[PDB]
Each structure stands twice: as C-alpha cells, then as structure tokens.
Design a protein around this ligand. Structure first.
Ligand code: HEM
Ligand code: HEM
Ligand code: HEM
Ligand code: HEM
Lengths: 141, 132, 132, 141
C-alpha cells in the first residue's frame, strides 16, 4: 500500500482487474455472506439471494470505491473521508468484518486471475486492503 | 465442525484433486511472504515442510468428527515446543483457502468455499486446543 | 482452564470482594467508549446490563471445571440471536481485567493477573463454543 | 493518538506518569511474561526472574521510548524509525505480541493511577499504543 514497491504492484494488479471490479466486488460479497453468516446482519434491507440486483448493485459501488482508492494511494483518508463516516460512525461496523471481506476479495481475485495473482501481488494487495480498512474504521482511530 | 451430507461429499471430492506437494509448497510460501513475521519459524524445504502441513490438513478432512483427538499431539508441539501464537493457525488456514481458489478457479464456488472455511476453522481450533 | 490449588484459592478470594454492580457498570461502560463499534449492541441500563454480565462471569469463576456447560445457552444467545463476533468476548474479558486492576491496585499482583487471564480466556472460549 | 482530543489526553496522562515511565514499563513486562508465556521466547538472553536487573533495565528503555513517542505524536514513523527495523526486520516479532504488551501496560497504569485512569484517558491511551505498535510493525506495512 504505502511502500513505493507496494503501490506499483497494487496499481499494476488493479489494471488487470479492469472493468471487472464491480463483478468481483459482488462475488466477494456473496462469498462473505455464505462463508461468514454473522456479516448478513448489516444488510437487513437487502435481498441476499444469489444474483440479487441489490448485491450486484452494491458490489459495483464497492468496486468503484476500490478503483477510486487505487487512484489516490497518496491520500486515502481524504478520498474515502465520506465512507469512514458511514462505516464507523453511522453503521458502527465491527472492524473484524473488514478482515473477512478482504479475505473474500482476495479469494475472488485468485479465482479469476490465477496467473496474475502471484505471491508478490497477493502480499501488496493484502496491505492495500488493510490500509483501506484502517481508513474506513478511522472513527475508531 | 458440523457439515451436511452434501457439504461433506463436496469437501471430500475436491480433496481427491489436491496435490499436497504443490498446494503445500505454495501455501507455506505465501504465508512467509504475506505475513513476514512467520519467517522467524522457517526453500526446497518450504516445499518439504509445506507437504507435511497439507498431509496433516488431509488427516483433518478425513476425521471431521474428531478434530481434537487428531491434532492433540500437534497442538502440544506448536504450544510448548515452538511457542506459535494460535492466531497464525487461522492465517495459514485462510492462505490455504486462497491457494485452493487459485488452483480450482470457478469450481471453487461460494458454497464450497463456505464449507472449507468451516473445516479450516475446525482445524485451527483443534490446534489451539492445548493453549487457552 | 487448568489452575493449581493455590491459584484457584487466590481467584476465589478476590471474587469475594467484587461488587458486581459497580465492576459490571464500569466494565461495560469502558467497552463502549474504548471500542465504539460495540455501541451497535447497546445509561442506567449500562449499569443494569453490566451487572448481568458480571453475575455471569461470577458463575464461570465458581464452575471452572465445566465452562462449556455453564455458558452453552449464552453461547447460542450471542451467536444466532445477536450475531456478536467472538473476538468481542476476548475484548470484554481484557477490559474486565483492567477494571479489576483499577479497583484492587497493588493487590492485583502480576501472578494474580496471570490467573485471571486464564479464567477470562476460558470464559471467552466457552462463549465462542457454538460458533466456529 | 491522532485526533487533537486524543493527543491532548495522551500528553496529559503521560505527564501524570512522569518519572515512573521506566518502573511501569518494567512491571508491564513482568505482567506480560507471567500472563502470556509465549512472549518469553523473544528474550532467551534475559534473566526473567522478578526483580531482574535486565528486565528493570529493559523496562526503562521501553519507558523512554514511549516518552519519546508522546513528544512526537506528529511524526511517530520518524521518531521510532530505528525501532521498527529492530522489531519487524531483525527480530520478526509477531504483531499479536504488541497487543499483549499494550494490554499489560494499560493494566499497570490502572494499578498505579486509578484516579487518573478514566474511561476517556483509557480510550486515548489504547489508540496511542495501537498507533505505536503499527509503527513498530511497519516493515509489515
Ligand atoms: C473494503 C472495504 C469496504 C468498502 C470499499 C466498502 C464500500 C462501501 C461503499 C462505497 C458504500 C456506499 C454505497 C453508496 O452510498 O453509494 C458502502 C456502504 C455500506 N457498507 Fe461498505 N464497504 C466495505 C466494507 C464493509 C463491511 C465489512 C461491511 C459490513 C459487513 C459493510 C457494510 C456496508 C453497509 C450496510 C452499507 C450501506 C449500504 C446501503 O446504504 O444500502 N461494508 N460500502
Ligand atoms: C495451522 C495449520 C498447521 C498445521 C496443520 C501444521 C502441522 C505441522 C506438522 C504436521 C509438523 C511436523 C510434525 C512431525 O513432527 O512430523 C509441523 C511442524 C512445525 N510447525 Fe506447523 N502446522 C501448522 C501451522 C504452523 C504455523 C502457523 C507455524 C508458525 C510459523 C508453524 C510452525 C512449525 C514449526 C517451526 C515446525 C517444526 C518444523 C521442523 O522441525 O522442520 N506451524 N507442523
Ligand atoms: C464475554 C463476556 C459476556 C458475557 C459473560 C455476557 C453475558 C450476557 C448475559 C448473561 C446476557 C443476558 C442473559 C439473559 O437472558 O438473562 C447477555 C445479553 C446480551 N449480550 Fe452479552 N455477555 C458477554 C459479552 C457480550 C458482548 C461482547 C456483546 C457485544 C456488544 C454482548 C451483547 C449482548 C446483547 C446485545 C444482549 C441482550 C441484552 C438485552 O436484551 O438487554 N455481550 N449477555
Ligand atoms: C509498545 C511497544 C514496544 C516498545 C515501545 C518497545 C521498545 C523497545 C526498545 C526501545 C528497544 C531497544 C532497546 C535498545 O536498543 O536500547 C527494544 C528492544 C527489544 N524489544 Fe521491544 N518494544 C515494544 C514491543 C515489543 C514486543 C511486543 C516484543 C516481543 C514480545 C519486544 C521484544 C524486544 C526484544 C527481544 C528487544 C531486544 C532487547 C535486547 O537487545 O536485549 N518488544 N524494544
């Protein structure tokens, strides 16, 4: 995330994700709901059935937010300032859930990009997700 | 821990396809790179030790109704001999899941992953047994 | 989990001095302030609920040889009804330790604390029992 | 740690710790070794008996490092740059151990400063210790 080498890897890896960011975000959400049933409690207003238009729509948003972050590795706190208010202040999301979603995103990237998901890239992406999660739980700073 | 008959069969069927050497080597290798403090406990021997880890996981997958007994000895090994904090058992487990996802692609469906997360949690908890 | 006869007596003797209302109120209050996401699950009712938490801990301290059975029902309550991630059980436990340190000062020696850390870990693990 | 309110609390609380920083650091180390036996593995060269001159000496160092940090809340990465190399690069200390030591330090402060260790101060100090721990495991960044 923060080391020059890590930023380079993150931007590179995300160029390979491309316009699939939204699709992967939606699949990562389904993996999280299935794998870790505790998380479902934050979405009482969603239809959580596979292929849900709500989950699809929400995955796209999550995907666009990450693509935004990758463009602003220099100033994550500023670029995601609004999102930290929502997650930590309004929703009070338990920080453990960010680790769970991050694991599910890495799993989804492994599934779709097996050749590009090298150990070096896996490492840099884990740091990236960890650094985003920090920002989004920043109200707990 | 507790799986249905259908989940258990999917879990077992995927394990028939797991090369313990190649999966083991890769899972241990990624642990060392992604979580660099584990380098305190550990190249051609990453492969050799990776293989032993996976062979042990395999034993869990075939003894799902008694994980505690299966890993009793290994639990003492990691606690009093090596002093490995049990949080790292959960980390290795998730790395193994990412590796299986990479190897199996679209066959590693959201449902199958959810089953493997149960198994990995069961295994990590059995290894933590004689700590806490 | 496993304490010596001497540790068990020190643990019990300190518990004779614990005001469950005042300790309970303070421990729950500090959880909410130090770990603000717990505010999702929860003032004069912080006191009332704090008291119930401590009364439950008290039951553990008097049933050290069967923590699993003692908290079986409470484990289901926190898992399927409330959906509390078990990491928070460990957090509350450490907050209780800090509160006991504040209340007892120099009598809460390094040795006595080490015993209470075993008890708090035992309790958190019993409450996580039907999750993982 | 980082919010103005938190920095104010941290500097205030540490003024009450004063010249006892070294003593408290040593006691926090004894609480950690006793409470969490796993940690002892990092000190094969220490005499770990109560009243050890080595533990006393080392507590003082730990105490001086925290007092340093409190004077540089603005630039923690720079002030503790050398320590992050030692902890994360040379020693490879498992990040969980920083949470354990931090709990033991808060326990020690509770023991000695029961009137000053208010919920507001406890909260700010937890953030402070968390932020220091981040810096010291920064090689894992
Ligand atoms: C990688 C970390 C995450 C990112 C990038 C992220 C992204 C976002 C974004 C962009 C929104 C706003 C949607 C909008 O207003 O357009 C949102 C809302 C939300 N997030 Fe997250 N999120 C993350 C983690 C989490 C976690 C771990 C949870 C809980 C399990 C969660 C639960 C929610 C909920 C309930 C909403 C409100 C949805 C709604 O208004 O319908 N998020 N998230
Ligand atoms: C969580 C899943 C794990 C499993 C199933 C597992 C299994 C094993 C097995 C089967 C052995 C050798 C047993 C024998 O004596 O034949 C071993 C040894 C060892 N393990 Fe693990 N392990 C796991 C995680 C870890 C982790 C996270 C670490 C920490 C870095 C670790 C550190 C070690 C070390 C240092 C040895 C001795 C290796 C040697 O002497 O070559 N293990 N483990
Ligand atoms: C780890 C030690 C804990 C113990 C021993 C404990 C014990 C209890 C007890 C005894 C009750 C009420 C039982 C009854 O029905 O009479 C309860 C309820 C409850 N607990 Fe916990 N608890 C613990 C931790 C937590 C944590 C960390 C949370 C998360 C914030 C939590 C959330 C709740 C909630 C929301 C209720 C329902 C309260 C109500 O309806 O007023 N508990 N717990
Ligand atoms: C609040 C977090 C911590 C602080 C402020 C801190 C402070 C320090 C300082 C200042 C030194 C250098 C002594 C010197 O060269 O003058 C040191 C060394 C060391 N630390 Fe830490 N430490 C922390 C956490 C930890 C943890 C969690 C562990 C492992 C359990 C640990 C293990 C060690 C070891 C083995 C040394 C080398 C001692 C020696 O050279 O004899 N430290 N620490």
């Amino acid at each position: 995330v923060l080391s020059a080498a890590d930023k380079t890897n993150v931007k590179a890896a995300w160029s390979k994700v491309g316009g699939h960011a939204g699709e992967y975000g939606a699949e990562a959400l389904e993996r999280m709901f299935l794998g870790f049933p505790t998380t479902k409690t934050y979405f009482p207003h969603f239809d959580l059935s596979h292929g849900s238009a709500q989950v699809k729509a929400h995955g796209k948003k999550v995907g666009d937010a990450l693509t935004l972050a990758v463009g602003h590795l220099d100033d994550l706190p500023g670029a995601l300032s609004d999102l930290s208010n929502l997650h930590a202040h309004k929703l009070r999301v338990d920080p453990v859930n960010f680790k769970l979603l991050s694991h599910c995103l890495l799993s989804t990237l492994a599934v779709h990009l097996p050749n590009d998901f090298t150990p070096a890239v896996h490492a840099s992406l884990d740091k990236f997700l960890s650094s985003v999660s920090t920002v989004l739980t920043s109200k707990y700073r | 821990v507790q799986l249905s008959g259908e989940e258990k069969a999917a879990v077992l069927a995927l394990w028939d396809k797991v090369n313990e050497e190649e999966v083991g080597g890769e899972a241990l290798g990624r642990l060392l790179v992604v979580y660099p403090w584990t380098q305190r406990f550990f190249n051609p021997k990453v492969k050799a030790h990776g293989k032993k880890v996976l062979h042990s996981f395999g034993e869990g997958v075939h003894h799902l109704d008694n994980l505690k007994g299966t890993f009793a000895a290994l639990s003492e090994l990691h606690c009093d001999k090596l002093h490995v904090d049990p949080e790292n058992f959960r980390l290795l487990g998730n790395v193994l899941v990412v590796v299986l996802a990479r190897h199996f692609g679209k066959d590693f469906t959201p449902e199958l992953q959810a089953s493997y997360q149960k198994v990995v949690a069961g295994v990590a908890n059995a290894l933590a047994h004689k700590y806490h």
